[PDB]
Structures are given as C-alpha cells and as structure tokens.
Design a protein around this ligand. Structure first.
Ligand SMILES: *[C@@H](CC(=O)OCC)[C@H](C[C@@H]1CCNC1=O)NC(=O)[C@H](Cc1ccccc1)NC(=O)OCc1ccccc1
Ligand SMILES: *[C@@H](CC(=O)OCC)[C@H](C[C@@H]1CCNC1=O)NC(=O)[C@H](Cc1ccccc1)NC(=O)OCc1ccccc1
Lengths: 306, 306
C-alpha cells in the first residue's frame, strides 16, 4: 500500500554526467559513448544571451575551446557540432558506464524523472510531468543547465529532457536530446512566458483508479456521464477535454477495479462540482494530475483491495 | 526556483542491492564489503510469522540454506549471524561497488530517501519523513522487504532504514541497519498498530522559510508570539510542541530571510487558526511537514528573492 511520486533509480544516468566549460561558463553535459551533449548556451556570455547568433559564436570556437571533466578526469574534445539547441562534443574516450539508451520526445501529460546536477555532480532526483503548456514544475538553481530527464524501461534509459531555462513564473523549459525545445521557447532573452496551463484530465482519472486499487471508494457515485457532457464540465474547470483515446487508455485500470471509465468520469464531475468535503484521496486534499495511467500500473498492486 | 520532494541520487545504493532466498521466501538484501544484510523474517514461513522463535528457526539453518544472488551471479554464503531483527550473511566476495558508508539511526521528523526494490532489482526512489509515531508513509508491495532508506553526505552513504512490514493503516515500519526497530513494533503477527501521529512543527516552519526564500510573503503578519503561547495553539491543532532547540536550529533560515523564528511562529499560528483562504504556499494548499531545515538549505537558493 501507499502511493508516492516515485522517480526511476538514477544510477545509470549518474554515470553519464560530466562538466562542460567554455570560457567562464560551466554547466552539465551528458556523456554517452564518445559524445557529450550540452546546452548550446554554454558558448554565450551574459550579454550574448539577449541576441546571440549561435552559428557565429560557434564558428569562433575550436575543439580546445571546450573543457570536459568527468569526475577528476579531463576528456579531450576532438570534434564539435551544433544540433538545434544543443552541442554535440566528440571526445577521446567512450564512456565505459554508457547504459543501453534511446532518445525520446515525450508528449504533454507524460512524466519523467529529473536528475538535478551541478558542476557535473548529481544532487537530487524527482519526478515531473510535462505540462500541457510544455513547461515542467522543476526545482533548479544557477548551474543546473544540462541536467537531464529520463525514464527507464527494463534496463534501457530513455532520455527525454535537457534543462535550459527558467520562466518568470518559476517553471522550467528545456529540450529533447535532439535539442528541440518543448513548447514555443527559445534559448535567448525575450519576454517569453509560459502559456496558460490546464489540468491533465487523464492523469486525474488514473489517480482516482489508483485510489480504488488501494482500497478507497468514497468519491464514487451512482451516476454515469457521456463524454460530451463530461467535457462541458471540464471546460468550466480548466481541465483538458477527455477523448475516446483517453477512455481506451484507461481500459486496464477500469478492468482491474470494475469501474467503467465514464462512471469514473461521473465521479470526477461530482468532485469538481462539489469539492472533496474535507476528505482526502490517497492522502491528498486536491485532485492530483502528475501520475499517468502507466505510473499507476507501475506502482500499484495488480490486485485491487476490494 | 521551484521546490520539490527531492531524493538523493540512488546509484551508490543500487550497486548494493541483492536477492536473498531461504526456502521459498525471497526478499532483498544489502551487500556491503563481504556482508549481506536482510530482514530476519526471510527464515520464516507464513505460519511461523504468528509466533516465530528466531533463535530456534536460525539454529536449524546452515550457510548453504541461504542463496544470495547479485545480478546474475551467485554469492556463496560462508557465515551467518543474527543481529536484532536482521541477519548478517558473510559471503565469499566483497562488493566491488561498496561506497563509503555509515550506519545511522535517524531521529523522528528527519527525512531520507527510499530505494524501493523487488527481487534484488531497484524499482523506484522517493523521499520519506520518519513520522513522530515511528512509521513512514512509503509505497511498498509484496517482495519489497529489505529495501533500504539512506541519506548521502558528500560521497558517503548513511544507511538509516531497512523495510520489514506494513501496518493496518497502510503505513510502513522497519529497522535501522543494526536491526533495531523504529518504534515499538516487532517482526511477528500481532494486532500492532501505528500510534497517534503528530504534525512535525519544525518542518512546517522550515518550509515556510523555503517559501519566503523563493519569494512569497503573503502569510506573514505584524504579530509575534511567545514560545508558550504558540504551544497552546500547537496542542489544539495536533502539532508537536516547539522547543528552544527547534528555535536555534532555525537560526540560519531566519538569518537568510530576516524573519525572527517567533515571528514566523506567529504567522503559523494565524494559518492554523484562519486557514489559507484558498491560497497556496509553494504550490501546496496545505501545510507541508516532510521537509527539514536541512532539506530546505540543501534545495533552496542561498539568496532570498527579496
Ligand atoms: C542554467 C544555466 C545558468 O545557471 O546560467 C547562469 C544563470 C540556468 C537554469 C536556471 C537558473 C535558475 N533556475 C533555472 O532553471 N539557465 C539560465 O540561467 C538561462 C540562460 C538562458 C536560457 C534561455 C534564454 C535566456 C537565458 N536563463 C534563464 O533561465 O533566465 C531566467 C532566470 C535566470 C536566473 C534565475 C531565475 C530566472
Ligand atoms: C515484505 C516481505 C513480503 O513481501 O512477504 C510476503 C507478503 C513485506 C512488505 C509489506 C508487503 C505489503 N506492503 C509491505 O510493506 N512484509 C510483510 O509482508 C510482513 C511480514 C511481517 C513482518 C512483521 C510482522 C508480521 C509479518 N507482513 C506484513 O507486513 O503484514 C501486513 C501486510 C501484508 C501484506 C499486505 C498488506 C499488509
């Protein structure tokens, strides 16, 4: 029993973190095989950041412009190239600790583990959802750029995030491991701000199922809803519209609990309209939206506490 | 910016997890140097668990009664001994991945990272507080026993918890790495239940400081309180009495924010009495008590957003 925001074990990622320095700027890099990946803004100074031309800044650098440090060992850079908003630095040594890995672009609403890192040294690990507005509610300070997000499937690490910036609301923006930003953000100084966010309806439903699996049914009701009538309520409460695809995704959880998806939707509608009346669900006084259906199946018992 | 429940990177611990089997019972062990630590209940069957005599059960075992598996490698057991509620199994191989480590008995209110493990294979990591009633609100299923809790200081792992049982309320109980239970619990079947819990006042105060460091002051007020008058309110709301020692511990956070501890106590008193009026603190609608003053200093900027 229990239900916690749970990250993946970080060991396979820790063995990949290095320090990258260009001029007076130091940040984190990701060392896989003989390549080090890092944010291209490592080549910028404070004043470059307003209007940097990365092509022009980079052509002025040699390989020996870059210092890469893995633990106490210096890795010699033997090639470099820009890929979107990242740099790919070729080094003289293949990382002996390279795990089986993939690069994946995660979708909004999906979750991943973040390994916060400073000066090539991992400091902490926590779980994040990719918000509908393409930001994450992370926890990052100066020096954290190049910290990565990932999931682990079997023993394969799926890297999905590299950290680049903080927005005015204190939320975080970054790229996939091909250097493409999540959301409309750019690695320069603009008045850029997070768009309006929405609650991840599919995740809220998954977590209600988690609560039933773990033995709690207080919030259920005798009613059902149509998808469309549910969505009229969702619009009112700034929830994402529910789709048939989301309904299908919830099949396994529905089957394990014996609660039809649209019946669970009716329960959610009532919670939205009436509140929780001083009660909790899985220890929470609010409706949680940062666990996916996958996260629920991963963590909960496969046997419902009936 | 941001503030998350953050675990320590788990890599140094992952390299220590193994599988221990006795008869048909398999659970996790912790392999350090040439010793494997695991819950002594590995030697019990289902029916033993009501009234087990561990001395009598253990004397009936040889070294080859125990199978230890590290990844795909079998470790031969060459000695065994009981220490309180754990077994210490001597093996033929020293763990090459043994980190610098200590065994520590953590105190109530303090936090640690848990590496949930099944069949010797780490599955997830999350942060827990040791509750005043000596339980943790973990997330554990069958097969999770022998999973460990830990903190990391520099590169030294301080192991502080090994998992043994779940109580009727769905919370968790276990031992330190000397095999002594936290709380009055025993590794047998009794009607044992978690005692009444209390909110960790020192942690709530620390987190209010975290909120000010991160830029939010909405909940402060023009008032002060005496320690004793604060404590009359704390009793009413099932909060731990605040002590002068707790006041002293909050010195650094007070200094960084310019808010005297007893002034922060007045703010807390008002929040308890009036509620939060639909507002949030660090994203939370409730008063959070699972971050210590140490956790706040670890994660927050050393510069207050004034
Ligand atoms: C990572 C690099 C860094 O530390 O550079 C020196 C400040 C850093 C992460 C950022 C720092 C505080 N919290 C975070 O998540 N990124 C930046 O500082 C980033 C550089 C950049 C990127 C894209 C566009 C423009 C600039 N700048 C940035 O995030 O600006 C907002 C900010 C900066 C510091 C504190 C709060 C907010
Ligand atoms: C670890 C060992 C195990 O899996 O044994 C087979 C069930 C397990 C952890 C426990 C399982 C569900 N959630 C957990 O945290 N511990 C036990 O099962 C433990 C053995 C024990 C220890 C001390 C005293 C008596 C028995 N028994 C236990 O926790 O009983 C309560 C329980 C068991 C299963 C599900 C829910 C509650």
């Amino acid at each position: 029993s229990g239900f916690r925001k749970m990250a993946f074990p970080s060991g396979k990622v820790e063995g990949c973190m290095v320090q990258v320095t260009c001029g007076t700027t130091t940040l984190n890099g990701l060392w896989l095989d003989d390549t080090v990946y890092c944010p291209r803004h490592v080549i910028c100074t404070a004043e470059d950041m307003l209007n940097p031309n990365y092509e022009d800044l980079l052509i002025r650098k040699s390989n020996h412009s870059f210092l890469v440090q893995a633990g106490n060992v210096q890795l010699r850079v033997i090639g470099h190239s820009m890929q979107n908003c990242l740099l790919r630095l070729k080094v003289d040594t293949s990382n002996p600790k390279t795990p089986k890995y993939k690069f994946v672009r995660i979708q909004p609403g999906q979750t991943f583990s973040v390994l916060a890192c400073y000066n090539g040294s991992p400091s902490g690990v926590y779980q994040c959802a990719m918000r509908p507005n393409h930001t994450i509610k992370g926890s990052f300070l100066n020096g954290s750029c190049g910290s990565v997000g990932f999931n682990i499937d079997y023993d394969c690490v799926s890297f999905c995030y590299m950290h680049h910036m903080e927005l005015p609301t204190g939320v975080h923006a970054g790229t996939d491991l091909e250097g493409k930003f999540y959301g409309p953000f750019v690695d320069r100084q603009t008045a850029q701000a997070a768009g309006t966010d929405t609650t991840i309806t599919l995740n809220v439903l998954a977590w209600l199922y988690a609560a039933v699996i773990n033995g709690d049914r207080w919030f259920l009701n005798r009613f059902t809803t149509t998808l469309n009538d549910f969505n009229l309520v969702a619009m009112k409460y700034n929830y994402e519209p529910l789709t048939q695809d989301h309904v299908d995704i919830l099949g396994p959880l529905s089957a394990q609990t014996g609660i039809a998806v649209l019946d669970m939707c009716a329960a959610l509608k009532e919670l939205l309209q009436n509140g929780m009346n001083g009660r909790t669900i899985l220890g929470s006084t609010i409706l949680e939206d940062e666990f996916t259906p996958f996260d629920v199946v991963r963590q909960c018992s496969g046997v419902t506490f009936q």
